[PDB]
Design a protein around this nucleic acid. Sequence first.
RNA 1: GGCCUUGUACACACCGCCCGUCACACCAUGGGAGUUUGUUGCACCAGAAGUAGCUAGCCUAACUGCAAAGAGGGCGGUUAC
Length: 117
Amino acid sequence: SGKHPLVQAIENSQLKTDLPEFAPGDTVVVQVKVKEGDRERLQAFEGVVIAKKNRGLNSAFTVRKISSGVGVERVFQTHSPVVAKIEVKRRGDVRRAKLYYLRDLSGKAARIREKLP
RNA sequence: GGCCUUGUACACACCGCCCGUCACACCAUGGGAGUUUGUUGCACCAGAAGUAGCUAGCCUAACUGCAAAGAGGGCGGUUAC
């Protein structure tokens, strides 16, 4: 709430009301809507959350994964309608908010310990 | 000019035989700044399926228990090769 009240009021009418709770270090599956011509489908993007920005309507989160030996990161905009659904598959145990150090690790070294209730 | 003997790689028989460089044509081959293929010795990194060990997170038909739940099993995690 660092913006003017009118801007806050305009942003508040667009907020999603069903996002789950998730934190950096988790692994999530994001369903993205893909539109080809008139063909609508859902595509899954599964990976580790390495960064999360909490800014209301301007909230975002970064997901990193390995695809056919190539690392790929996508910075999803949380409240965009393109993100159909977010599932939390596993909860991780980390010590910091941003996990950019995972970019320099591979395979076993990049494993994240599971957070145990 | 004639006879005997001797040496010879000459026998078309010394107008013999025959050697090497240079020039010409062909053939195989050695060396050579480098270029490139296969294979291999170490040293390290990464590492699947699989097997062996340890775990206690989760889930559970046959057994035990009046039942609560145990035993056993499975998934997961993890170490070695």
